[PDB]
């Protein structure tokens, strides 16, 4: 894989929500050595990766829906 001497946040912009039916998996990363803010990355059914806003009320609900 890649070799990086610097670690940076994987997200730049953030969406307010996405249609749940098109979401296949979601990755939630807590604040850590490589990023100050929480990052929620959604992997769509079509292979595209999209960012989600952790503070968005909808985003929290979506993760709860999947964990059903």
């Amino acid at each position: 894989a890649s070799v990086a001497t610097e670690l940076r946040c994987q997200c730049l912009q953030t969406l307010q929500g996405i249609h749940p039916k098109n979401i296949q998996s979601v990755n939630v990363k807590s604040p850590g050595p490589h990023c100050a803010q929480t990052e929620v990355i959604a992997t769509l059914k079509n292979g595209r990766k999209a960012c989600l806003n952790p503070a968005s009320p909808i985003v929290k609900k979506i993760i709860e829906k999947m964990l059903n």
């Binding site: 730049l12 969406l15 990355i41």
Partner: protein, 297 residues
Amino acid sequence: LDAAPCEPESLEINKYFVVIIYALVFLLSLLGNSLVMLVILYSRVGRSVTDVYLLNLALADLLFALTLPIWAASKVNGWIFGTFLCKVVSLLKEVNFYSGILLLACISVDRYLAIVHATRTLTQKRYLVKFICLSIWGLSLLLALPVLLFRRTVYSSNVSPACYEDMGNNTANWRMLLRILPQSFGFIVPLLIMLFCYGFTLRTLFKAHMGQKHRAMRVIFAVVLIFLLCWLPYNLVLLADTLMRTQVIQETCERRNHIDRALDATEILGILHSCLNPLIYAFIGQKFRHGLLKILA
């Protein structure tokens, strides 16, 4: 869905070519520094003040090069060597890095007093090289503690393991502050001391009536340029990285890609100081050149 992860881009071409360049630098520095150590230590007569500075500089560069093989292998497949070495190796590398630069500042001060103040009694303060070198080594260890305290292997998903820092939830901002030490006591302070000392040293040599004044100035100019060339590109990139994180300069996926390559390239350039140092400072003098021939026999 305009927002998407900024996937890192890495090319295999860069990584393996770096290993050979690191290995080549390792061989030359190991051989060059030993000869400088061999020449001075073989004969204890005429051990001038400059001999002590060179001896420490040779040791500082020798230790720094000694860690290159581990660092080179890290660039191949990431830090696979565990957490303990990520602290010890980082300590040894940075301790010598700080000491190496500060000695170049001490050497310049010694030359400034030797030439500019040759007549006066202030030049008598250059017989404390024994203790002054102790102070620099002690100060360097003090400036490398943050590396020892706040380093560990940071496993990730996109990237292979790295020997990064872990200062807490706000490590991103705290790491930037810690970069002030290398960029304050490592580049600016040494640079100002070197330029001031060599700035005035060239003023007396430009007015004296010797015959060797011409070669001395060209040696002084070479020393300054080699320092700027090796370190200035690295610091400018580092400053650019800090500005981008603070949102002073607009951040984009392309810019982050460019800086990543720039940091890797410059770091190779900066590491060459451990190789040119024997040539620039030691082997450009008659005493060492004549000394090496006699030792061979």
